[PDB]
């Protein structure tokens, strides 16, 4: 509830692509089911992956910058 994307990957709207992708590359490697198949890293990676879409696609971020969560029909509930 109050589902963060930017902050779940550790950013705010105002982070540039070169901040965003900086974090995203690290954040994938933190839990990747291809690096750290750690028990419960995968669900972390899966929740990151919802944020990861925003935190890479500038057209997804265009809606998240203009609005935020209230703009973005990721997951609903």
From Swiss-Prot:
User: Where in or outside the cell is it found?
Assistant: Cytoplasm; Nucleus; Nucleus, Nucleolus
Name of the protein in question: DnaJ homolog subfamily B member 1
Q: Where is the J domain?
A: 2-70
Coiled coil (residue ranges) = none
Q: How does it assemble?
A: Interacts with DNAJC3. Interacts with HSF1 (via transactivation domain); this interaction results in the inhibition of heat shock- and HSF1-induced transcriptional activity during the attenuation and recovery phase period of the heat shock response. Interacts with BAG3.
- Transmembrane spans: none
Q: What is known about its induction?
A: By heat shock.
Top-rank lineage group of the source organism: Eukaryota
Q: What does this protein do?
A: Interacts with HSP70 and can stimulate its ATPase activity. Stimulates the association between HSC70 and HIP. Negatively regulates heat shock-induced HSF1 transcriptional activity during the attenuation and recovery phase period of the heat shock response. Stimulates ATP hydrolysis and the folding of unfolded proteins mediated by HSPA1A/B (in vitro).
Which residues of the complete protein does this chain represent?
A: 1 to 76 of 340
């Amino acid at each position: 509830m109050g589902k963060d994307y930017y902050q779940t990957l550790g950013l705010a709207r105002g982070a540039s692509d070169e901040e965003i992708k900086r974090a995203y590359r690290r954040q994938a490697l933190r839990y990747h089911p291809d690096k750290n198949k750690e028990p419960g890293a995968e669900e972390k990676f899966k929740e990151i992956a919802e944020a990861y879409d925003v935190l890479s696609d500038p057209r997804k971020r265009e809606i998240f910058d203009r609005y935020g969560e209230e703009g973005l029909k990721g997951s609903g509930c």
